[PDB]
Amino acid sequence: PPSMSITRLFPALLECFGIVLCGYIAGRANVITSTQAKGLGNFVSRFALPALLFKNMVVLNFSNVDWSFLYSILIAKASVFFIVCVLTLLVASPDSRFSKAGLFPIFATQSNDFALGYPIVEALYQTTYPEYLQYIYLVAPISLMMLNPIGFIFCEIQKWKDTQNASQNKIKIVGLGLLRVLQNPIVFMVFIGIAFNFILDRKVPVYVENFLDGLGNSFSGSALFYLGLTMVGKIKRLKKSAFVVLILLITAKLLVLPLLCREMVELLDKGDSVVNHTSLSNYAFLYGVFPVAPGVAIFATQFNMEVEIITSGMVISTFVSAPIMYVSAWLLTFPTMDPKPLAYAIQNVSFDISIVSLISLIWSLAILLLSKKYKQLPHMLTTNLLIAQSIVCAGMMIWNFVKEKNFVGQILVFVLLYSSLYSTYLWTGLLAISLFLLKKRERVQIPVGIIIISGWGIPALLVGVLLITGKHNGDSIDSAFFYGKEQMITTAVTLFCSILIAGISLMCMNQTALQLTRHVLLCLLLIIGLFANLSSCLWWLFNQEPGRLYVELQFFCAVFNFGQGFISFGIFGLDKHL
């Protein structure tokens, strides 16, 4: 029982974010401006989406719906809404506690299901369990109807605050929130679909079937395109602790909502089939991983309260959720399997990450080279770092196709890939040390040539030492055990020395105190990658038996080792002016 067509998930994550990338490219170039994107959004939100919802609620089978999963998923969302509203009510400022308490729990519970979740669920669940596709169209509008009025009451209280007549008349406000919920196209189109499911007896009329198919099949691509068009220039800057609350909200939505969904599904679904329960638990975890829908930013726009935070949160959560679906789904499918074909799964995941990392690295390198900022510090060491990560990805490109052909080509590919990887490891520390030296503003001529010589020679010297002294393992198909324990000891020493050098330089920068505003976080986000890289090397030497936690840590080593170009591109390449 595979219960997940996980082979065909990466093409789905390529479609759903390639159309978003196309919309973003068309928005920033200047092909479709904001006003014309408003017309495309008018088409999508008023013609394609109601036809999709109406068709899929007409043909829906209410006899075969496992309701236990449905109200378990809703109990999870209700708990998330309740806790986020509770601490947003306690800790926020009195002049804006009600707007935040009405918009943040809406932000932390409303997934982007009809645009992004439906193609991903369709790819993972058409050929194995086709009945899970209807739960999107069942759960998302019920979640809207049962969670949005509570938030809208608070935002209408905040709108009441400015006027301030102490009118009372609670009907006037809570019925206003309720009718705002009912005027949403999803809600009354699901009501109409529920009525016509019983009127027409679960069958769309033949004269109307093709019209509804033509309007519903145009929702996916145009909706993803309009979502990509929505993100142009909306990230803005922020303020201290607004960064922190943005981290907390996106962390809540993408982390504690899926674990609550899994826990309440494992608590409330009491079926007699274990494999069905396991597939329901995995699908419940996958459902919460979907990003925040743009309807929350629309709601904050019509209320005209906290528009910057919610818009930044949606455009940040959509990007951030893109690797989280892949990593989470491959972590869910790692139970059972088999010991030895797990290595091919790890290799396939690293290959699929390296494709996107190489393309984004080519983009960021082209932007940095054409803008002529590569000659000025500190961007020269960054250019060296991105070149090294490109050699890492190209080494995986070679290594996937040459592991079973020749020993000499495999040895050369391993030497090049680990030289580039170790160079990236110490290049993070070299960039941090250069940032600490430039932050002191002293008259010290920084030897950038000597730094580049060290960054190109020390990993090469380590690779040569591992080639001269290490013993080749012919039965090892994974890259992490090419020379056995000698290679892992060399990677552990390089990671520990680089993290300690970068950690001292990062702590010295705060005590001594674009450019430095983003540079630090790109240095910061790699240290979490190097910390997870160091722990798996420590886990292998001290423990003889590799457990399942070692499997998860090796997978995280693959993502934070081979997707560093993605993080670098998100920080550096996606930026204007240059």
Ligand X SMILES: CCCCCCCC/C=C\CCCCCCCC(=O)O[C@@H](COC(=O)CCCCCCCCCCCCCCC)COP(=O)([O-])OCC[N+](C)(C)C
Ligand Y SMILES: CC(C)CCC[C@@H](C)[C@H]1CC[C@H]2[C@@H]3CC=C4C[C@@H](O)CC[C@]4(C)[C@H]3CC[C@]12C
The position carrying tokens 């009945």 is: 131
Cα–Cα distance, 305 to 351 (Å, whole number)? 43
Q: How many residues bind ligand X (CB under 6 A)?
A: 54
CB of 12 to its own copies, least distance (A): 6
User: Is the CB of residue 361 less than 8 Å from the CB of residue 390?
Assistant: yes
Q: Dihedral sign, CA of 380, 441, 453, 491?
A: negative
**Site residues for ligand Y, window 216-235 (CB under 6 A)?**
235
Residues in a beta bridge with 292: 111
Hunting for tokens 């990450």 — which residue is that?
Answer: 353
| Residue 129 binding ligand NAG, by CB under 6 A | yes
Q: Rank residues 137 and 283 by Cβ distance to ligand NAG and give the closer one.
A: 283
189 lies in the binding site for ligand Y (CB under 6 A):
no
Q: For residues 165 and 150, what is the distance between their CA atoms, to the nearest angstrom?
A: 22
Minimal distance, residue 238 CB to ligand Y, in Å: 6
Residue 357 structure tokens: 């990392």
Task: Return d(Cα 111, Cα 287) in angstroms, integer.
Answer: 8
- Among the candidate windows 250-258, 353-361, 533-541, 546-554, which touches ligand Y by CB under 6 A? 250-258
Residue 312: exposure state from Cβ atoms within 10 A (0-12, 13-18, ≥19): buried
**Beta carbon nearer to its own copies, 42 or 96:** 42
Determine contact, residues 297/316, Cβ cutoff 8 Å. no
Q: Strand, helix or coil at 388? A: helix
Q: Determine, following the binding rule CB under 6 A, whether residue 251 of this chain makes contact with ligand Y.
A: yes
Q: Is 560 in the site for ligand NAG (CB under 6 A)?
A: no
For residue 527, state whether it binds ligand Y (rule: CB under 6 A): no
Q: Is 247 in the site for ligand Y (CB under 6 A)?
A: yes
Cβ proximity to its own copies, 145 vs 355, nearer residue: 355
Residue 340: contacted member of ligand Y, ligand X, ligand NAG, none (CB under 5 to 8 Å, by partner type) = none
# binding residues, ligand NAG (CB under 6 A): 5
> In a 10 Å sphere around its CB, with 0-12 CB exposed, 13-18 middle and 19+ buried, how is residue 275 labelled?
exposed
CB of 352 to its own copies, least distance (A): 8
Within 304-333, which residues bind ligand Y (CB under 6 A)? Answer: 316, 320
- Print burial letters for 481-500: b (CB count within 10 Å at least 16), e (below 16): ebbeeebbbbbbebbbebbe
Residue 25 assigned ligand-binding role: no
Least separation in angstroms between residue 334's CB and ligand NAG is: 22
E strand intervals along 98-230:
none
Site string for ligand X, 83-102 (x = CB under 6 A): -x--xx--xxx------x--
Locate breaks in the chain with C to N over 2.5 A; list the residue preceding each: 513
Distance CA 17, CA 131 (A): 25
Is 500 a binder of ligand X (CB under 6 A)? no
Using the rule CB under 6 A, is 532 a contact of ligand Y?
A: no
- Give the tokens for residue 245: 């609350």
Binding-site member from 168, 170, 183, 207 for its own copies (CB under 8 A): 207
CB 94 within 8 A of CB 243: no
Q: At 190, give phi and psi (nearest 5°).
A: -70, -35
What percent of the chain is helix, strand and coil (3-state, nearest 5)? 80, 0, 20
Q: What are phi and psi of 269, to 5 degrees?
A: -75, 110
Q: Which does 273 bind (CB under 5 to 8 A by kind): its own copies, ligand X, ligand NAG, none?
A: ligand NAG
What is the closest distance, in whole angstroms, from the C-beta atom of residue 306 to ligand Y in the complex?
15
Instruction: Please select the residue that binds ligand X; options are 230, 360, 420, 536, rule is CB under 6 A.
Output: 360
Q: Cβ–Cβ contacts within 10 Å for residue 203, how many?
A: 11
129: left (phi over 0), alpha (psi -120 to 50) or beta: beta
- Does residue 250 interact with ligand Y by CB under 6 A? yes
Using CB under 6 A as the binding rule, whether residue 283 contacts ligand NAG is answered as no
Rg of the chain over Cα atoms, rounded to whole angstroms, equals 26
Cis amide linkage into residue 378, ω under 30° from 0: yes
Least distance (Å) between residue 131 CB and ligand X: 27
323 binds its own copies (CB under 8 A): no
Binding segment for ligand X (CB under 6 A), chosen from 148-156, 260-268, 356-364, 500-508, is 356-364
Region of residue 3 (phi > 0: left; psi between -120 and 50: alpha; otherwise: beta): left
Q: How many residues does the chain have?
A: 578
If you search the block for the tokens 């509008």, which residue do you land on? 141
The annotation status of 27 as a binding-site residue, yes or no, is no
Q: Is 362 in the site for its own copies (CB under 8 A)?
A: no
- 206 is a site residue for its own copies (CB under 8 A): yes
- Each residue 339-378 as x (binds ligand NAG by CB under 6 A) or -, in order, gives ----------------------------------------
Instruction: List the binding residues for cholesterol.
Output: 10, 24, 233-235
Which residues of this chain interact with ligand Y, rule CB under 6 A? Answer: 235, 238, 243, 246-247, 250-251, 254-255, 316, 320, 521
Which residues of this chain interact with its own copies, rule CB under 8 A? Answer: 8, 10-12, 14-16, 18-19, 22, 26, 31-33, 35-40, 42-43, 46-48, 119, 123, 206-211, 213-215, 217-218, 220-222, 224-225, 355
Instruction: List the binding residues.
Output: 10, 24, 233-235
Which residues of this chain interact with ligand NAG, rule CB under 6 A? Answer: 129, 271, 273, 275-276
Which residues of this chain interact with ligand X, rule CB under 6 A? Answer: 13-14, 17, 20-21, 24-25, 28-30, 84, 87-88, 91-93, 100, 104, 207, 231-235, 241-242, 244-245, 248, 251-252, 256, 315-316, 318-320, 322-324, 326-327, 353, 355-356, 359-360, 363, 559, 567, 570, 574-576
